[PDB]
């Protein structure tokens, strides 16, 4: 069995029935509307269903007739590439490598040694992928889309004036040649070297010589021009800075492309985030913040190495979602476990070429832009607050409802929530929105705060909330959600120069979360001991992510300090109490 052999067999992303989508939409706005607003929205939806919507839907069906995935290109552009805000901090997702839970606890002086092994395992993953030896993901006997794995290596975003682009240089052995070098960022400088020698992958001792060489060379020398810091800027500012940089010397483009085509970028940081099984929220913070001078925000996969032997991944969210990163990070975690975090092979170090430095041609203007880039990123990142803890009826639904209750208790109102739903059953399927803030969820939350509510009432309403969320998640992952569908209708109109339908201008459309206005941006990040996180979707909102183990729940929450109303730590404390109360309710109801 080969990694991508089922791709040509995957079913097309479906287009739900208009009526069902509009029914679900109407039901979703109830928690945020009074009688009048609801009646208004209902009439707007009815007219839409009878007129413009019916026509736009037909056009969407025609698009689907010619595309195995009618949403793919649109989603990439509208959700990522066209967005102008600095993506490195506000869009990229990060994930700490869980090796400090066992063999690699935080310890000064272990950066280079552990680093050599981190690269070795990551590269072995790449070899498996290139040979298509990576196991095909399946639900039962049904294969899932594996296309996102092509975006892990040799993939990089390139800034544009109005629209960025994704360059995917990866290729399996059957398709052709694939770049074989990695890029290392250190002290505002950049180096590259081939990972192959005489046909085989170089070993940890050899990789250690490369890293040691780079580290030692830069340590007692001033920080370089830090061109990488430009990747953390507002997208248009970076696009222009990139054009200017290239105008200074054609060769500069060659240097940029070398970074772009590298299997991945490895960053050497001199900071040491507190990272223990108990407290490691700081790893998330330095991963999203850090020193821009050694981070290539546009890279799909930027492996980060801290001074205390701690590691993490920072990824561009544009080409793929977090699960690919979770998979490789877990793969590495297993390798470290099986090897006791050591290289027990030959200590020989063959005579391989030393890393080559990419020396960019720069002038006073470029250096001023670089300076500006670093400053804006550091300032913006300093406003980020991260709270991470471990707590020890589908678990995902349980957590989603607990979050609803926690927010309800902490802020006194239902929080419109976005939960990622994967649609990998379909060709190049990525995600769909699950709206956790349902009428059922709110009714249950009210009963939990209702002194006159009987144990039986609370249990009954909670179960009804579970059932609703479960059905919702199932439909969404099966392509029957409605958020992407409505987006598609909107894009059909725009692409033809037709006006925006009134349904989207309706106050309830954005109050219910539409248009990227969810106060709670959430997602399960799997069951592989790896945790991921991104900043909130809105200034006065939260980012809440988690992963599930057979004996615990691990959560990571983000919020903006400049927003006095929100507090990531308090929300996490609140959800833990929520977990407690729900557990108690279930056990008591047990009887």
Curated annotation (Swiss-Prot):
It is an enzyme of class 2 (transferase). Its main location: other. The lineage of its organism: Eukaryota, Metazoa, Chordata, Craniata, Vertebrata. GO terms for molecular function: carnitine O-octanoyltransferase activity. It is found in: Peroxisome. Changing residue 313 to M: Increases activity with octanoyl-CoA. Signal peptide: none annotated. This is Peroxisomal carnitine O-octanoyltransferase. It comes from Mus musculus (Mouse). The active site is at residue 317. Beta-oxidation of fatty acids. The highest activity concerns the C6 to C10 chain length substrate. It catalyses: octanoyl-CoA + (R)-carnitine = O-octanoyl-(R)-carnitine + CoA; 4,8-dimethylnonanoyl-CoA + (R)-carnitine = O-4,8-dimethylnonanoyl-(R)-carnitine + CoA. The modification N6-succinyllysine is found at residues 30, 47. Pathway: Lipid metabolism; fatty acid beta-oxidation. Its EC number is 2.3.1.137. Transmembrane segments: none annotated. Keywords: Acetylation, Acyltransferase, Fatty acid metabolism, Lipid metabolism, Peroxisome, Transferase, Transport. The keyword Cell membrane does not apply. The keyword Acetylation applies. (R)-carnitine binds at residues 418, 420, 431. Changing residue 325 to A: Strongly decreases activity with octanoyl-CoA. A motif (Microbody targeting signal) lies at residues 589-591.
């Amino acid at each position: 069995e080969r990694t991508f052999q089922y791709q040509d067999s995957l079913p097309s992303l479906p287009v739900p029935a208009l009526e069902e989508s509009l029914k679900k939409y109407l039901e979703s706005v109830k928690p945020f509307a009074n009688e009048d607003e609801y009646k208004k929205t209902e009439e707007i939806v009815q007219k839409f269903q009878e007129g413009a919507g019916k026509r736009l839907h037909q056009k969407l069906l025609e698009r689907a007739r010619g595309k195995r995935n009618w949403l793919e290109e649109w989603w990439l552009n509208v959700a990522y590439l066209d967005v102008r805000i600095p993506s490195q901090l506000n869009v990229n997702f990060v994930g700490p490598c869980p090796h400090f839970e066992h063999y690699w606890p935080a310890r000064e002086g272990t950066q280079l040694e552990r680093g050599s092994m981190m690269l070795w395992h990551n590269l072995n993953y790449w070899q498996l992928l290139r040979r298509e030896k990576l196991p095909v993901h399946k639900s039962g006997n049904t294969p899932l889309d594996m296309n996102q794995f092509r975006m892990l290596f040799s993939t990089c975003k390139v800034p544009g004036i109005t629209r960025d682009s994704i360059m995917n240089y990866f290729k399996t052995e059957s398709e052709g040649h694939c770049p074989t070098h990695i890029a290392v960022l250190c002290r505002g400088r950049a180096f590259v070297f081939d990972v192959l020698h005489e046909g085989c992958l170089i070993t940890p001792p050899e990789l250690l010589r490369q890293l040691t060489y780079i580290h030692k060379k830069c340590s007692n020398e001033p920080v370089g021009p830090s061109i990488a810091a430009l990747t953390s800027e507002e997208r248009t500012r970076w696009a222009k800075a990139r054009e200017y940089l290239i105008s200074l010397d054609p060769e500069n483009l060659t240097l940029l492309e070398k970074i772009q085509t590298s299997l991945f970028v490895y960053s050497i940081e001199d900071s040491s985030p507190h990272a223990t099984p108990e407290e490691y929220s700081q790893v998330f913070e330095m991963l999203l913040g850090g020193d821009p001078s050694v981070r290539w925000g546009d890279k799909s996969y930027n492996l980060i190495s801290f001074a205390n032997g701690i590691f993490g991944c920072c990824c561009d969210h544009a080409p793929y979602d977090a699960m690919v990163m979770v998979n490789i990070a877990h793969y590495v975690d297993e390798r470290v476990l099986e090897t006791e975090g050591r290289w027990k092979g030959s200590e020989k170090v063959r005579d391989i070429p030393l890393p080559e430095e990419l020396v960019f041609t720069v002038d006073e203007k470029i250096l001023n832009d670089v300076s500006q880039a670093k400053a804006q990123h550091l300032k913006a990142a300093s406003d980020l607050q991260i709270a991470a803890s471990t707590f020890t009826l589908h678990p995902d639904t349980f957590i989603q409802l607990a979050l609803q209750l926690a927010y309800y208790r902490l802020h006194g109102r239902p929080g419109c929530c976005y939960e990622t739903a994967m649609t990998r059953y379909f060709y190049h399927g990525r995600t769909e929105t699950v709206r956790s803030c349902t009428v059922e969820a709110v009714r249950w939350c009210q009963s939990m705060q209702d002194p006159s509510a009987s144990l039986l009432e609370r249990q009954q309403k909670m179960l009804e909330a579970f059932a609703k969320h479960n059905k919702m998640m199932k439909d969404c992952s099966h392509g029957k959600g409605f958020d992407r569908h409505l987006l598609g209708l909107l894009l059909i109109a725009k692409e033809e120069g037709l006006p925006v339908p009134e349904l989207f201008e309706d106050p309830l459309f954005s109050r219910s979360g539409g248009g990227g206005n969810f106060v709670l941006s959430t997602s399960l990040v799997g069951y592989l001991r790896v945790q991921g996180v991104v900043v909130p979707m809105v200034h006065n909102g939260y980012g809440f992510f988690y992963h599930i183990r057979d004996d615990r729940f691990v959560v990571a929450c983000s919020s903006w300090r400049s927003c006095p109303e929100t507090d990531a730590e308090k929300l996490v404390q609140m959800i833990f109490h929520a977990f407690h109360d729900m557990i108690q309710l279930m056990n008591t109801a047990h009887l």
